[PDB]
Design a protein around this ligand. Structure first.
Ligand SMILES: Nc1ncnc2c1ncn2[C@@H]1O[C@H](CSCC[C@H](N)C(=O)O)[C@@H](O)[C@H]1O
Ligand SMILES: [Mg+2]
Length: 260
């Protein structure tokens, strides 16, 4: 019983290195992030330049009402902190706590002074899967590493989803959770069951590359799982045909400066 997403995964794996390369950015939405690129690679933040592409992904969802962060924000798997620092600029957000693994193969928090930096605390060296859940108003989680195997992507997603369940049981009023693999029938059933229990819906963020089927389970969406997943699968499959399309650019994120 093969889904569209599984056919996309199979075809993605059949691509030559050149085909994959041309495909992965074809027609996507993008932020250029030229302008403080060397500063970031040096490990010094510049003003209100975002520390990662993640700020733009969160911005895209917030600008469209897919969630309205407020109160105490928890950011699981914060990496460099792009989500935490974007959240700190939202008027109703009061406090941001980010946790991430860091160390060798992994992103360390970047320490910056974009607007609202002083209500942000990011901590490295923590395994979020070993943290007991805690009350919060806005729950964010951006964890899930890609794999050429769909069974692996699926298993990795189910572990993430089991982990956030403890946090959702605390009943945050807003959330945004990356779903690395939504495209197997087991995943779709699991996601429907989670939406029945916790609400929200799945959204494809168009700044995601075509090389990942990731979607975001967000409290401000209402979507049908089959509709949102199948539409994404069909978009990704369609971009495999025909000539390569250019990227569409948004304005770089500007998180300003100053305390709150
Ligand atoms: N068990 C775990 N505990 C803590 N962090 C983890 C983890 N598994 C993966 N991660 C971290 O989750 C992060 C996913 S990256 C998230 C991008 C971030 N939203 C931003 O905007 O910058 C990675 O840095 C990775 O190291
Ligand atoms: Mg940017």
């Amino acid at each position: 019983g093969e889904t569209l997403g599984e056919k996309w995964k199979a075809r993605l794996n059949q691509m030559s290195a050149l085909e994959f390369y041309s495909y992965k950015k074809s027609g996507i939405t993008e932020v250029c992030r030229e302008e403080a690129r060397r500063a970031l690679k040096d490990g010094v933040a510049t003003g209100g330049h975002a520390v990662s592409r993640g700020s733009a992904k969160l911005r895209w969802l917030v600008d469209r009402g897919y969630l309205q962060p407020y109160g105490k924000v928890i950011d699981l798997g914060c990496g460099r902190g792009g989500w935490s620092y974007y959240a700190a600029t939202i008027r109703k957000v009061q406090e941001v706590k980010g946790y991430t693994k860091g160390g060798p193969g992994h992103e360390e928090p970047v320490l910056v002074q974009s607007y609202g930096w002083n209500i942000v605390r990011l901590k490295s060296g923590v395994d979020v899967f070993h943290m007991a859940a805690e009350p919060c108003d806005t729950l964010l989680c951006d964890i899930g590493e890609s794999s050429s195997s769909p069974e692996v992507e699926e298993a990795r997603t189910l572990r993430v989803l089991s982990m956030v369940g403890d946090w959702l049981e605390k009943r945050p009023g807003a959330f945004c959770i990356k779903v690395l693999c939504p495209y197997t029938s087991t995943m779709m059933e699991t996601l429907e069951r989670l939406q029945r229990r916790y609400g929200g819906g799945l959204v494809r963020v168009p700044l995601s590359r075509n090389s990942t089927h990731e979607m975001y389970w967000v409290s401000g969406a209402k979507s049908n799982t089959i509709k949102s997943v199948s539409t994404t699968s069909q978009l990704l499959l369609g971009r495999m045909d025909g000539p390569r399309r250019p990227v569409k650019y948004e304005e770089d994120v500007n998180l300003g400066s100053g305390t709150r």
